[PDB]
């Protein structure tokens, strides 16, 4: 359980969607982060993979604001303290807004994977995962925006998948957090995109899995990494 509290881009903080404050306020502030109704600081499980909730979390609506990123620049997402128990991958996707991200129809967004990290070491099951790298970095993740993509406005869909309960059907816990970016530079790729509701299926090999046994491999879920 947790959420993205802050985003650091080009030397400033863009406050996140503080899901334990703003839903209680009813004139809440404009941010680059999508609003959600996930006030339990919880997840979307396999029962919601083909519902709109998987796209940018439960009841999500676009952020009003968009943050510019320098070409090949970094976006640092700062989480609330991630529990060690919640082992799993950290995955990052972009989807083009083709206009102002604040007015997009999330159900039409087509995402391409720009980064993925999974099982890092398995010397002591359940092992060390991307989520453990995030904890070791004091609960932050650095995303590098590719220089090869067409610039414009994009949703960044940043996600941890916790696998501590994933040996049961619908046990994997997805924690997507979306932010609005203005990608800048000289690139031209328009990578093939995947609807939010086709990223994951509740029987995928990196989703329905017992992490407590020795693992020979881990197949990071979602569509193929763009390079
Ligand atoms: C996180 O930062 C705090 C100090 O702000 C430190 O006490 C803690 O050990 C840090 N680093 C790691 C690797 O967790
Ligand atoms: Cu949790």
Swiss-Prot record:
Gene3D superfamilies on file: 2.70.50.70
Cellular-component GO terms for this entry: extracellular region
The protein's Enzyme Commission number: 1.14.99.56
GO biological process terms on file: cellulose catabolic process
Primary role: Lytic polysaccharide monooxygenase (LPMO) that depolymerizes crystalline and amorphous polysaccharides via the oxidation of scissile alpha- or beta-(1-4)-glycosidic bonds, yielding C1 and C4 oxidation product. Catalysis by LPMOs requires the reduction of the active-site copper from Cu(II) to Cu(I) by a reducing agent and H(2)O(2) or O(2) as a cosubstrate. Is able to cleave cellulose and xylan to produce C1- and C4-oxidized products.
Family: Belongs to the polysaccharide monooxygenase AA9 family.
Protein name: AA9 family lytic polysaccharide monooxygenase A
Organism: Thermoascus aurantiacus
């Amino acid at each position: 359980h947790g959420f993205v509290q802050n985003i650091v881009i080009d030397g400033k903080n863009y406050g996140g969607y503080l899901v334990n404050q703003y839903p209680y306020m009813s004139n809440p502030p404009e941010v680059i982060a999508w609003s959600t109704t996930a006030t339990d600081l919880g997840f979307v499980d396999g029962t919601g993979y083909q519902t709109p909730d998987i796209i940018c979390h439960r009841g999500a609506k676009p952020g009003a604001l968009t943050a510019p990123v320098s070409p090949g620049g970094t976006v640092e997402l700062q989480w609330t303290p991630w529990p060690d128990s919640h082992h799993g991958p950290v995955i990052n996707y972009l989807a083009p807004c083709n206009g102002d991200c604040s007015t997009v129809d999330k159900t039409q967004l087509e995402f391409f994977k720009i980064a993925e990290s999974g099982l890092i070491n398995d010397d002591n099951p359940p092992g060390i995962w991307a989520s453990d790298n995030l904890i070791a970095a004091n609960n932050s993740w650095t995303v590098t925006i590719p220089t090869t993509i067409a610039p414009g406005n994009y949703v960044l869909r940043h996600e941890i998948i916790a696998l501590h309960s994933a040996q049961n059907q619908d046990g994997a816990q997805n924690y997507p957090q979306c932010i609005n970016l203005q990608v800048t530079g000289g690139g031209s790729d328009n990578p093939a995109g995947t609807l939010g509701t086709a990223l994951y299926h509740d029987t995928d090999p990196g989703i329905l899995i017992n992490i407590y046994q020795k693992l020979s491999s881990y197949i990071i879920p979602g569509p193929p990494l763009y390079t």
